[PDB]
Every structure is written in C-alpha cells, then in structure tokens.
Symmetry: C5
Subunit: 273 residues, 5 copies
Amino acid sequence: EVLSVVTGEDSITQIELYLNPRMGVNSPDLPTTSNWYTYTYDLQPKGSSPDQPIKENLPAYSVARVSLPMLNTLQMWEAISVKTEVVGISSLINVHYWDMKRVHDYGAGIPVSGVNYHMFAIGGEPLDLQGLVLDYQTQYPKTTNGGPITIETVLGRKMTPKNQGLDPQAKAKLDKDGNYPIEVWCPDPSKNENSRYYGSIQTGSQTPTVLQFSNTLTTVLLDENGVGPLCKGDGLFISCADIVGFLFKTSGKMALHGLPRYFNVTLRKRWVK
Amino acid sequence: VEVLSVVTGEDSITQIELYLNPRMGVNSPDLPTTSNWYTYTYDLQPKGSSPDQPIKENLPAYSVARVSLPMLNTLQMWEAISVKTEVVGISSLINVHYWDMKRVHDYGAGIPVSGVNYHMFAIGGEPLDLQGLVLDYQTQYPKTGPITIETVLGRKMTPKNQGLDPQAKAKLDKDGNYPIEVWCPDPSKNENSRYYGSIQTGSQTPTVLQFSNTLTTVLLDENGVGPLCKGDGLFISCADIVGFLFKTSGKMALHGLPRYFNVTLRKRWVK
Amino acid sequence: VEVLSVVTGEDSITQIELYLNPRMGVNSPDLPTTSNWYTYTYDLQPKGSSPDQPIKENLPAYSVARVSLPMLNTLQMWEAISVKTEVVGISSLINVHYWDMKRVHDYGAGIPVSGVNYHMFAIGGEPLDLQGLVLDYQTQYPKTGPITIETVLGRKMTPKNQGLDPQAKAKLDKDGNYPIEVWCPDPSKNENSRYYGSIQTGSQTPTVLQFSNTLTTVLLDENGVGPLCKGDGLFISCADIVGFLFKTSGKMALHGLPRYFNVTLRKRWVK
Amino acid sequence: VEVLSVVTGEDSITQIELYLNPRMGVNSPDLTSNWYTYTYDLQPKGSSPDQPIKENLPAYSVARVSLPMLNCDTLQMWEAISVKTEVVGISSLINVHYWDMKRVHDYGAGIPVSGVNYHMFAIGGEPLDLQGLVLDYQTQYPKTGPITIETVLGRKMTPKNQGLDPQAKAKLDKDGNYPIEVWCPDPSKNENSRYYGSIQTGSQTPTVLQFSNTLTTVLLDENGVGPLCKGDGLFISCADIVGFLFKTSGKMALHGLPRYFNVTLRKRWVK
Amino acid sequence: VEVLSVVTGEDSITQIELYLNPRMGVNSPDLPTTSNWYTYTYDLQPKGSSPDQPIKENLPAYSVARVSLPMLNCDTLQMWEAISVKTEVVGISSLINVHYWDMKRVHDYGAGIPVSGVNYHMFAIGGEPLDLQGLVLDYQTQYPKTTNGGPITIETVLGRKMTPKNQGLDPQAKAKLDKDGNYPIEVWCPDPSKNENSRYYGSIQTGSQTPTVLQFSNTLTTVLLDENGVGPLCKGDGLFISCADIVGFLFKTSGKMALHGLPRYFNVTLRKRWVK
Ligand SMILES: [Cl-]
Ligand SMILES: [Cl-]
Ligand SMILES: [Cl-]
Ligand SMILES: [Cl-]
Ligand SMILES: [Cl-]
C-alpha cells in the first residue's frame, strides 16, 4: 500500500546508465569473433525444415539492475521520470562500408535500413515477458548447451502450435542481459503493474530508419494515480532493445544491427505500508 | 433505458482481463496436422478464372468473447469506462529466417511479415452491429462454416452488395465466424459499443505497430456514459492482421496476432 | 440574412442519418447488363493519341443528397452543429484473392486495392459551390450526361481552364453528375458550407483509412454559427476513391466506398 | 516604426480575397499556351553546361493588393491578422488518362501526377525578402527573362552561391520572374512578413494534399502584431508545384496548381 | 554555478544572428581547382576490399561557431541566458532542380533523380562546446591521420587504434565540438550523458532515394528553457552554435553518388541572468 511522498533534503536522486546492444555477437572482448559486435551473423532462410538458428542470429533484450542508495511502513525509491536516447545514430550515415552492397553500379552502399525494433522499460522489478513465436517448429539452441532462454526452457517441453498464439504458460522475467530473444519474448501486458514500457516495430527490407534524438525530451513514469515504479529491494530495473536495420553485404548477405541506449532516471522517496 | 446516477459504495468498480487469439482461417491449435498454420491463412492466390470460391482457411474473421460480469440485481448495470488494450507478440515479427521464407534477393534475409494490415477493437454492452459489403458480389463464399451476406439474406448477393445494402446486417455473436472481408462495423447502429479501427493496403508495406502499458482509451461518450452491459455481459471484439508471410515458391499467407484487454467498469443506476 | 439567438425549447434539437453510395462511373446496381462493375470505373488508359475523349464510366463523380428537414415557418432555420461521418466497408479491401486480380509476383496474392485516393465530405445549408479546373483543357468530355466546364460555359474550354478561371463555376446539385477530375470545392464561396478533403496520388500507394464511432466533427465557424439550411434543406456531399483494382491483363479500374453521416442540428433565429 | 494600439470602431476590419495562378514556365494562357501551368520537358543533358530555358524554371507567384487608404507622425496602418488559404484544383489530379501519359505497366492507367512537390505561401506588408542559393553555381540561367543571382550581383556566380552568400539577396516584387530553384525566403530579414513552406523530393513520391474551408492561419507574431502594410500595400506570395506529368516518351514536366487567399486585416495606430 | 534571478531593467534582452555554411567534405568555396564541389562530398563508394580508408572529402562534419556576446561584469555575476531560437535550413527550394547537367535520369529521357536519400539534421544551442560521443559502423575503418587539426576521430582522441568496443558505447570515446568542419558526423554524435548546458535536437533518415521532406517558416520558435525555466548559460560570454544538415545524394550519370548539405540560419534571443 502506497502512502505519501517523502519530504526532505536528499529525497530526490538521479541515476545514469547506458546499455550496449546484444544483437548476437554480444561481446567486444572475444579474441576473434568480436569484429561483429553490435551485429548478428548472416540471416538466411534455411530452405528446408526445421529452422535451427544459431545464437549469433538472435538479437536479445538488454537489461540491467541498478543498486540504489539504501533506505531503511518503509521508504522505497519511486521512479518518476526518465530521459533516454539511442546513442550513435549519426554513425548510420556511413554508406561506404568496405563490403557494402551498392544501391546500383558505381553507387554508394545501401544504408542501414529495413527492420527496426525499439523499446525501453523502467520498473521496480524484472520486466514480465510473454512468449510468442512466428514458427513453433523453430529449434532454438538449448539453454543447457549455452543457448538463450526460450519458450521450451520455461515449459520444460517442446513448443506446440499454440505458441504461435498467446499461451499463458509461456511466461518469463527479463532477468538476464543478452539471453532473452526479441523474436521469442515481448512485454506481458497482463502483468508489469510495477513497470513502464514503450515500444515499436517497423518491418520491410529496406524501409528507412527514421530516428530522433534530443536532450530536451522527458518521459513521465507516473501512472493514472500519480505513482511511479516502486523499487523492490532498492533495485531499479532498466531494459531495452534497439534494432536499427540491416547491414547489406556485397554478396547479398544481410545482418541486423543495433545501437546502445542511454538513460537518466529521476527517483524520489515514497512511504509505503 | 434511461441512465440515472453512478452508484457510490465499496465494490462499485471492477476490472476485467482477457486475451483473444487471432482467427485467421486456421483457427485451432489443437488439430491433428493442420494446426501448424494456426494464426495464418492458407495460401492466398487469385485463381485467374471466375468465380472466386474462397476456402474458410482463407477468410480471417473477427475475434469475439462475451465476458460474464458479477451479477448485480430501476436496476444496476455495469458501465465500461476505460480500457487498456495491446497487440501481443509484436516482437515475433523481427524473424527474417523462417525456413521457407522468400528472400529479398540472392543470399539475403527473408522478406519480413509486411503488407496488408487491419486492426480494430470494440468494447460494448451487446454484440457489435455489422454491415455487409464485399469487393465482388459474385464471390461464392462457403455455406454454413463462415456467416456471410448470403447467409443472412437467405438469397444470393446482387451488385448492390458492392455498396451499402441496408438489408446486409448481422451481429458479431460468434468467434471466428464472420469474415473481415465481408463484414465491417455498422456506424448506423452500435450506440452501446465503442469501436476503433484502421486498414493499410499494399503488398510489402511496412508493418508499423506500437506497444505500451501506459496507454488508456476512455470509453465514455459525449454525455459521459460508457457502454452499459445488458444481462451482465461485456462484449469484446477485435481483428489484427499484421501482413503476409512470404514463402519461397512465391505463395503468400496472411498472419494475425492476439490482443490483450484490461477493462475498467463501474456500477450505474438505470430505469 | 442576420443570425440571432439559438432557439430554446423541448424539441429544438434534431438528428439526421443517411448514407451515400459511391458514384465511380458505373453508378447503378440495378442495370441487368452492366451493374457487375457498380462502385468501379471501367478500365483507365491513356489513349496514346489526341484528344482524350473519356467515357462516363471512367469519370468518378461527387455523391450528393438534399435532406428535407421539418418545416419551421425574422424566422427559424435549422443549423447543422456537428457530424459523425464514416467510410463504410473499409474491411472489404483486405480481399487479395479477387479472381481476376494481378498477382504481385508469380503465384502470389493479388495486388490489394491501392493507389490514388480522394476523400472529401461537406455539410451545407445549400449546394456546395464548385470551381472547375482540369489537367488538360483539350479533353473532350461526354456531352450532357456529366456536367463539365463546357456545359456551364456554353463554349469550348481554353488554356486558362488548366488554372483558375472565375467563369468555371457550378453548384453541386445532382448526385453522380459532376466529375471529380473537373470540379473541386470553391474556396471563394461556400460560406454556408463546411468541407474537408484530401488527395493521395501514386499508383500502388497504400490505402490507409480509419473508422471509429467516437469521432465527431464540429461544424461551427469562428463565430459559433453552423450552416443554416435554406428552405429547410440540408446538403450532404462526398467522395471516397480508395484505389485501383489491378486486373490480370494489366488493366486498372478506380474503386469507391460508401459513406455514412449522422448530423446534429439545432433551431436558430435569423432575420 | 513604433506600433501603438489597435483601432476600435465600426469599420476597422476588412477582408481581402484573391487567387494566384501558377507560374511554372509557361505562364500565360493567352498565346504555346497548351502547356500553361506546366514546365517544358525537364531533362539532364548529359554534358556541360546546363543552360536552362525560362519555360523550365517555375517561379514564385506574387501580387500587391492596394488597400483602402486610411489617412501626423501617428497614422493608421492595415495589419494582417489572419488568412484562410487553399490550393485550388486538387481534385483534377485524379486524372490518370491524359492522352500522352506514360503507363504504370502495359495496359495500365497512366502514372498519376506525383514526385517533387514545393508548397509555400507568404503574407506581408512589403515584398518578401529572398535569399539566393543554387544546386550548381555553373548553371547558366537566361539573361533578363528571369531575375537570378547573376542579375543582382552584376557578375557571374562563384562556388559560394552553392552556399549562403549574403550578397545574393533580392525582393519578390514581380510575378513569375523569380525562379524557385534560385530563390528561397530570407530568414535573416522578413520581419514584416509571415511565410510557410515545405519541399518533398523524389520521382513518383505520392502527392498528398488537403483542402478545407475551416482552416485559418493566425499572422500575429509573439507580441500579437501582424504584418503592417506600408503605403497601404498587402503582399501575397506563393508557389505550389504538385508533381510531374509523365509522358509516353519518357519525358517529364512539372505541374503547378493555383492558390486562393482570404486575408483579414484590422486598423492599427503606428508612430 | 548557482542560478539566481532574471535581471530586470532596460536592455536586459539581446538578439544574436548568424548562419553556418555546410561542411560536407569540400569545405571551402575559395580553392579554385576543387571548390566546384563545395557543399558536397566526393563520390561515395564501398571499396570492395579491407580496410576502408576514407578520404576527408567523403566525411561530412559538424558546423560550429562561437559567438562573442556583450561583456556584462565578485561571487554574484550576470551571464547571458539563451531562452529561444528561430532556426531555418536555408536554400531548401534549390532542391527542385532536376536538370543538373550530370544528373542521372530517373528513366530513359526523364528528369533527373532529385536530391534524396540519407538525411541527417541537427542543431544545438549551448553556453559551452557541445559534448560528443564517438561511435562508428566499423571499428576497422582507417580514418585519415593529419597534421592540421582535422578530421578528428576516435583514434585521434584515444591516441591509439579503435577496438570492437567502438562499434558500441565506449565511455573513453568522448570529445568537445570545438572546431568548425573538423568532427565527422559518422564518427560523433551528441553525448547525452553530459550537455547539461546545451540543448540539442536531431534526426536521421536512411534509405537511398527516400524523399527529402523539409519545412521552412519564420514563425517557428524553439524554447530553450529546461524544466526549471533555465536556458543555456554562456560562460566566458560565448554562445556556442552547432548544426549538421545533410539533405541527400546527388545522383550522377555514371551511377556515382555524392552527399549534399544546406546552410542553417539562427536567431537566438538571450537575457541577462544573475548567477553565483
Ligand atoms: Cl520501430
Ligand atoms: Cl492498419
Ligand atoms: Cl486521400
Ligand atoms: Cl511539399
Ligand atoms: Cl532526418
């Protein structure tokens, strides 16, 4: 039960973080494979059943838990507003990647474009996820083999046709950076009372990537009762995903690309019962 | 049905929650060996000769549910005042590696789900009123099966059914049985429902969709009165076609996503 | 005519409902011979030689009705204050399996109704004022029968009719008779009407349309006065071209949808 | 020029109506006049230099309106406070059967007027201040006969006229003489004008335009002051390029539409 | 650093006007042999082999100016506070030209493909240099090493080679936008983790022939006050103005393509503010 806002000196605090994209090649530090950090490997229809995608072809949600100043009818940190920005947008004007497919003979490269997916979330606990897939017959790498967490992971059995729709048993929590595939998991609207999430998709193969950036834009995190996400155990949960389109390679091969996201969250102290 | 004052008291407000799975043509996930295409149509392909005889698996239909509300009884009725609604599984559409997906060019990714979209929802205190109108009146719809204009008139369609025929009316009272291409919301009725919809045409038109748990639709009309649930029944209807799945052969199927609803209702005195 | 106060009394507000079927070129559903193409044009093609001599079936025209209002009679006039309007049958445009539909690629679905859109509606207390302007003044329109610039001028068009010629004026007083490609609302007149319209060109441009029974248009001008119905007549006009039907041969016909109106009117004193 | 109080009295408001026909290159209908409201064929040579013809240089429309004379160090001036403006003849663009139109494909309709759009209007109490900037400084425009950067400089352009050169300035004082591709509004001046404009580039980009007689633009600045009409002259300027006419041969010509204005003015004391 | 009251009395408000010409790669109009390409890049092309070694002329960069403000002046001082700006991309109308002699025709005998494709638009008003964050499409790109202070890239500020982490957010890859036409747009974006004393506003549009859609109007004002009602405060009596306005490609007959940019105009209103 939520009570009055705490009045006093150090009642407001400001938290900063950035999250690097987890597109498939999720580390910049690996000796050899890390050239493709912020990218997938080449995305291709197999041409025969079943699909058996590799983890490098499975862009995943970014998530971080931020520890907040210790507080203790108790006081909890309440997230009230956030400034967030996708970073490195200007990098996408580059149309002279050495192995870029040209728009036509002697032309510039096809710029990063096509499929976009953009979401962020701010919550006082992990984001609630609902599982739904394009094709239930997809064989995702097993979690026990080092793969991501998918619907088969949570069910403890194979997906059935119902997982192409909304199966209420196909649920999870976003508690692991770079391990929950975007194509498997979306925000669960039946839950997430203590989170605020905002997202969009854009399909098409060469659809223009259209993005804005400004340090003047603020998202208010209060619900219709004037209450923001309340941070359980002094943890603020921050999640996102920013697919910005394909890198088109000379051969015809295509890899998805992501960008990092920055957050500045304002929190206040709130009495709870 | 004269509307009196809003009821005051302890248990005067309730919230109703549900989800509706899409009824694209393959409507059940529980079938021997046809359910692999659940949430899809079969292949949509102009025959090249008349007449068109579309199969039921090629007719996306409206989803509908009647939610039973806590029994109440000048009487009290539940009044829907607002709704949070969301299209679920939007993220599933970043998949450009379906095993049998047509590629955008040699060695490239699959053409993503794109093209024709159609998105509507309705919240009402009775079944949504429907108006019949078809692209081609000479279309031979299967008999009962889906309910079409021929079904309701008990005679064949004539050219007037390419426009607005006042006799071509139905009530959306059955899940997965009223084809989208045949029926639309009747704006001449639906006093006790609220509906919101759009269409997008084109073959590879980008599917552009938003999702947020911060967005609320107010269901009150200009007199501050929401839909009043007759017989303690709330009717929820929707359709969400999100584009085509492009197969290697060149064939194409339409695809749909489920929709979630959270409706807030209050008690209302009525005479 | 001087506008006085709004009339007060029990029966001073009234509501008017109607629908207008589209007049695309084949304008009747009742012709045993040709009505299959009702709500469509015939095939649209450049002749390849001069001059263009378009047939009436290829000239979409404005829809119009005069609604008779209750007789009131310094006297009282009906004042249109708001309107709920909706394009009907939007959902029909998801059909991508018309038997003679041009496939998007080999073995694919049909090219959806798409391309050129033109959408307008008007509410007035007298016929809409029309201004004539054409793409090509050398066009030989069928004699009256559609009413064109030649009809009103009593002589051949000249180059000036490719721009604004103040002599090229008409009243929208007949359903299905004034070609959209010749006539547009006249902004220099129409003080007793409200009109709202748009165009979309391109050949395969997505048709993007919305429908809701919650959207109202306010018809009051900046002085709080709506159209006043001369002789107790309410004039409702519209046009809704929704794109091309792409046929297997390559041929293309423009298509239209009907429109619904619910207009609220109040009594007003005038001198 | 010190602005005092608004004049109050019986006859202190006036309305100015006018229309401006487009000046796309063929600027008169009273001759060649078949192509009035169009350019000639726009076509990169493939070799240098470009020496465009005047018929290929769409220009700004302008009119000075003589206002009722009003009149001391302190006198009355007309102040433009608002305007209704509308692009006329938008409906004419539904024509996809110009006799010489390039087809979208074999047997199909003509490619609709579409592609490059440029739309701007301006209301001022003096001529619109113009800034010169060209795509290519090596372009050799015709001598006076349109007014260009060379005309005002009295010498040939240099590379800097591809950017902002502060010497490349002019006033929009003559209808049909200032090329759009050479001149844009000068944001460093124009204190006594309001202007509003947009561009859209591309070859077949949909032309998307709206029209309504219910839309007003307020001309008051941040201090509640509209343009003040020096010597009782109101200056009205525009351009409305609506896309290409696509010809069978592959040749392409730009097309313009006229614009209507209704300007409301009030009397204002000035020192 | 503590903001007190707005100053009152005559002449507390001043206005600053300027324009910034674009720096697309060919940055001067005064070099007789190459200045024909002023406001354009050279031809943009994927090399076909590793590594990319891009030339300066192919690196559109930010425009920046530092405007000197009137002197005003102790613990309590007056500073200029930028409160609003009218800004406009100039020469938008020039883009209707589809008959450039070497313009690629849209189809046989047709008009030229108009300037279109990749747009990038941003402007900033600040009381100090804009803070930059470095991030590149490909970390293996070998940007030019020069001796004349430009182009400045990630390697320049690190004093060592980029690693894979420079395809993401590397907190060490930071700089200040302190020199006109020297900081490449494809390397640097505004740093949202700083810039407390600047306001910035920007967008991108990708695709190759995507319509260039721009507006212009002298009635458009951008308010520069933060949520506390405080605009950028000009330290050293210096107002920093930055922008970039890439408006698309020039499609040449050969198939070759160059990016093009337009200048930007600014009218900034400032007021005197007491500070501690
Ligand atoms: Cl998106
Ligand atoms: Cl839609
Ligand atoms: Cl339209
Ligand atoms: Cl435009
Ligand atoms: Cl942009």
